[PDB]
Amino acid sequence: GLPNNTASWFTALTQHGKEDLKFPRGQGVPINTNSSPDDQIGYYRRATRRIRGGDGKMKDLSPRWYFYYLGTGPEAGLPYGANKDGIIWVATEGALNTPKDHIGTRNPANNAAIVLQLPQGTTLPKGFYAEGSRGGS
């Protein structure tokens, strides 16, 4: 029912290889300081939009991998474990497998995305990077 104004609390990921992005159990989810450990769960979904180009004509921006808590975003209503092509299952140690509707997403007009930074020991997949951030370790 909500409007078409839902953004990812954190930055997105850009693909630069054949890999389709994949993380092991207990990894993948960025560090959230303004949130709980049981809420450190969700899934990644690719998004495609067209932004105004420099020459004036709108240009279709490349696809990016966005993350959002469970029960939120476009791919909302899918319980942990539910298979689905194009979607990745992420979860951190202690993260609870439940919908975080109470939290929801973060509107871009109201606020911006936070620099995505994985926890110590965790590393992004070969051929991928983080938007906004500078790197890792």
Structure tokens at 130: 């983080």
- Tokens in use for 11? 């930055």
What contacts 33, CB < 8 A, 6 or more positions away? none
- Best CA proximity match to 111, nearest among 38, 11, 40: 11
Q: Tell me the C-alpha distance between 2 and 78, whole Å.
A: 17
The alpha helices in 25-103, defined as continuous H runs, are none
Is 64 one of the annotated binding-site residues? yes
Q: How far apart are CA 29 and CA 122, in angstroms?
A: 9
User: Any residues with CB less than 8 A from the CB of 55 and at least 6 apart, and which?
Assistant: none
For residue 126, count CB atoms less than 10 angstroms from its CB and return exposed for 0-12, middle for 13-18, buried for 19 or more.
Answer: exposed
Domain ranges for the chain, please list them.
1-137
The Cβ of residue 21 has, within 10 Å, a number of other Cβ atoms equal to: 16
Q: Which residues pair with 106 in a beta bridge?
A: 7
Elucidated via: NMR
Query: In Å, how far are 57, 76, 86, 112 from 39, measured between CA atoms?
Result: 40, 15, 22, 19
Query: Any bridge partners for residue 62, and if so which?
Result: none
- The answer to whether residues 10 and 118 touch, using CB atoms and an 8 Å cutoff, is no
What does the alpha-carbon distance between residue 37 and residue 77 come to, in Å, rounded to a whole number? 21
Q: What residues contact 77, with CB distance under 8 A and at least 6 apart?
A: 71, 99
Q: Please tell me the chain's helix, strand, coil percentages from 3-state DSSP, rounded to the nearest 5.
A: 0, 25, 70
**Backbone region of residue 37 per phi and psi (left: phi > 0; alpha: psi in -120 to 50; beta: other values):** alpha
**Region of residue 6 (left: phi > 0; alpha: psi -120 to 50; beta: else):** beta
Task: Check if the beta carbon of residue 2 is closer than 8 Å to that of residue 62.
Answer: no
